[PDB]
Design a protein around this ligand. Structure first.
Ligand SMILES: NC(=O)C1=CN([C@@H]2O[C@H](COP(=O)(O)OP(=O)(O)OC[C@H]3O[C@@H](n4cnc5c(N)ncnc54)[C@H](OP(=O)(O)O)[C@@H]3O)[C@@H](O)[C@H]2O)C=CC1
Ligand SMILES: NC(=O)C1=CN([C@@H]2O[C@H](COP(=O)(O)OP(=O)(O)OC[C@H]3O[C@@H](n4cnc5c(N)ncnc54)[C@H](OP(=O)(O)O)[C@@H]3O)[C@@H](O)[C@H]2O)C=CC1
Ligand SMILES: CC(=O)N(O)CC[C@@H](c1ccc(Cl)c(Cl)c1)P(=O)(O)O
Ligand SMILES: CC(=O)N(O)CC[C@@H](c1ccc(Cl)c(Cl)c1)P(=O)(O)O
Ligand SMILES: [Mn+2]
Ligand SMILES: [Mn+2]
Lengths: 379, 379
């Protein structure tokens, strides 16, 4: 019975929650592979001693060294683990477009792919899709896990709009003016639950949502002018679908990535007690309000990148990563993140071409990153 | 494919909206028979003129006398028309227990039953289930249509509970006291041109939700203690399905029965443009609050009555019918409606038996009214 799972980026936020669900359901899953950057050795050590898995991948050469006994090391350590470890599912919980190679390697083994690393799909684009077979990529991201469950009840020609909900980030309601005084402390702190750093910042910049709009077009095949976004502070409703008759179906639950993770891992069977359900034993209200595009153009920028397509989406992400890094380092301002992105994108003309090989994509991201530094150093 | 529809109760609210839907979607539907009571004979004859259907039935002979060329007339006219008409869908929009025979005749023809009539299920419980085959009955009630669509979110064995939403009525969140000086007009007991003061009252009394809770059990097989009710003022979400993993699927839409009516008619294919969808260009809110059962025991009784099965639900509804009348005639106070219902059910233990024939159900009701009328006059 048990499904054989490989966890990439097991030491991270998604990763550890994934091993909890696997630990709490030994009847459904078995851990057969682990991979990490190398920055959280003690975590990785305790993960090995607990799951009893030694088939491990560590990116950092020096780190893999002082730990000893690690079969795969170096930047390709994660991709090699995938190619040589038989599994049923590969949970890609790595962060960044760097996870693009493990994703392709995973699809190529034929195993299912629990995707969390959205950047590999955004950057991969059509390249990754050709690699995947119908329904091989199961979403872990909560908006997509939701859309999936909501679409279970219908056919595409009956779908009118896909409505993605966004928390609005912690600066929701502010003006372009106020935004300029934002500091790395305010865009990486969260009052009620936690995620990784990069994903936390993108949440504040609304670029994460932009990233999810593209992930949606790619995963579900719905055109960009039929994928909506709406701010929902509570983040209880995780996404909705509107059908041609006027009916809307939506997925809801108290925030907890454990939910979409256990579903992705157990696809197509739900996992009992994976998470807590909405409690109507006590009053509450679910609010909705439109996103302010003038103050947060991030999502419009994503759509534009998407419509143009090709490696244009990889540029979008490559640019963001460089500016977000420049931002947290204290080299540029917050409004500058989206700003630097429109700049890089306005010049990405030669990249509207679909990628023929990973290389075409590495080339586009390469270009984007530099053009992004040039724009940063331009300030 | 063009489905052939038989509309029972064509001059009513559900029936005229069904005809609007059919009129605006000829490519999908076609009317091949209409049935009314005779209270609005002129409207029925005009419908004959408009649609071109001569295959009509009127219950009232007196009324039928005023026309002379009606194929089916007299008690059982509607049942005869069903048995005599070839069709793909019979829409039962009849009111009261007299809608029970037509529902049964319909199921026997094997046609799809878009069931609106509440007594068919609430009164003829086991008689209707044993008679219908799986998936033959598609609900027209907004709450049930919602649950039908949300259940596509998982298998029957993954459903942890069904959550029906109620508007709460006019005395929503009121205190047990407040309900003392409650008068008829307050409970919206107005003489509207179309539907009687009962709905508005059952809705203000939560007895409607109770009946809906009973119909839910019989339609989806979910044990009563796993059927919750929650107050939702806006009435946008119509019901939700919570699964064993914590995910909850909800169905939202602006209030318009044409939506659930167009579902039942062409299930499972959605009808383009049936109703208007939820627009999120506008900042709205969906509020939820629990129901104080100690102030509205209405729903708790429905569950007790339905757990007892047999004709006990018929008792529940008949007992309410009279009690409601007593309140509408000042004979009793508001809190007294559910209280009297409480009494009548506590003494109907004999009606726990499964009804064998339609007469078994009518008797239970004839009985419950008597007993309820007694508790009013205090005899
Ligand atoms: N956290 C959340 O709530 C959500 C996350 N996601 C997505 O899931 C993905 C991961 O999110 P998250 O867990 O929060 O990010 P984290 O920062 O918490 O973890 C990132 C993981 O990747 C590993 N890693 C970093 N670099 C490399 C490398 N070069 N080679 C191999 N492994 C590496 C890290 O190992 P190390 O121990 O050395 O750091 C770490 O385990 C992201 O793409 C994100 O967008 C999506 C929706 C929700
Ligand atoms: N209205 C709503 O929003 C909802 C209604 N429902 C249920 O759907 C059912 C019908 O609702 P609704 O349309 O509003 O009720 P209506 O009073 O508006 O219409 C009842 C219809 O049945 C006809 N009728 C009455 N008696 C007979 C008879 N003996 N033989 C043949 N036809 C007869 C009437 O004709 P005539 O008037 O000429 O006598 C009329 O066309 C009910 O059981 C109700 O509870 C469920 C959910 C929502
Ligand atoms: C959990 C998840 O899926 N995310 O994308 C984290 C970021 C998003 C977010 C932030 C906070 C919460 Cl509680 C939730 Cl459910 C989602 P956002 O809507 O701000 O972009
Ligand atoms: C012809 C005209 O102007 N009318 O207002 C007809 C209204 C008629 C009417 C009244 C109420 C209903 Cl619900 C229906 Cl279907 C039809 P009536 O039964 O009163 O004749
Ligand atoms: Mn997300
Ligand atoms: Mn209803």
């Amino acid at each position: 019975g048990r499904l054989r799972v490989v966890v990439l980026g097991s030491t991270g936020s998604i990763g550890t929650q994934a091993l909890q669900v696997i630990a709490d359901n030994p009847d459904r899953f078995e851990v057969v592979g682990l991979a990490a950057g190398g920055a959280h050795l003690d975590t990785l050590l305790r993960q090995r001693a607990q799951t009893g898995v030694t088939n491990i991948a560590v990116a950092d050469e020096h780190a893999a060294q002082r730990v000893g006994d690690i079969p795969y090391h170096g930047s390709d350590a994660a991709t090699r683990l995938v190619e040589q470890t038989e599994a049923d599912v590969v949970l890609n919980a790595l962060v960044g477009a760097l996870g693009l190679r493990p994703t392709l390697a995973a699809l190529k083994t034929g195993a299912r792919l629990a995707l969390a690393n959205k950047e590999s799909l955004v950057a991969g684009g059509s390249l990754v899709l050709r690699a995947a077979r119908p329904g091989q990529i199961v979403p872990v991201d909560s908006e997509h896990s939701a859309l999936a469950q909501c679409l279970r009840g219908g056919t595409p020609d009956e779908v009118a709009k896909l409505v993605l909900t966004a928390s609005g980030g912690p600066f929701r309601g502010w003006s372009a003016a106020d935004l300029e005084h934002v500091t790395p402390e305010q865009a990486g702190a969260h009052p009620t639950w936690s995620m990784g750093p990069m994903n936390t910042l993108n949440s504040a910049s609304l670029v994460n949502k932009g990233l999810e709009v593209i992930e949606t077009h790619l995963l579900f095949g719905i055109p960009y002018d039929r994928i909506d976004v709406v701010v929902h502070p509570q983040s209880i409703i995780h996404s909705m679908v509107t059908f041609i008759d006027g009916s809307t179906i939506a997925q809801a639950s108290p925030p907890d990535m454990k939910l979409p993770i256990s579903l992705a891992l157990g696809w197509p069977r739900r996992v009992s007690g994976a998470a807590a359900a909405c409690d109507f034993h006590t009053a509450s209200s679910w609010e909705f309000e439109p996103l302010d595009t003038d103050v947060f153009p991030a999502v419009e920028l994503a759509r534009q990148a998407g419509v143009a397509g090709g490696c244009m989406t990889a540029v979008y992400n490559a640019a963001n990563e460089e500016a977000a890094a420049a931002f947290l380092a204290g080299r540029i301002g917050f409004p500058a993140i989206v700003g630097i992105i429109a700049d890089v994108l306005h010049a990405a003309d030669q990249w509207a071409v679909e990628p023929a090989t990973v290389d075409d994509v590495l080339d586009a991201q390469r270009w984007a990153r530099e053009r992004a530094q040039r724009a940063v150093s331009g300030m």
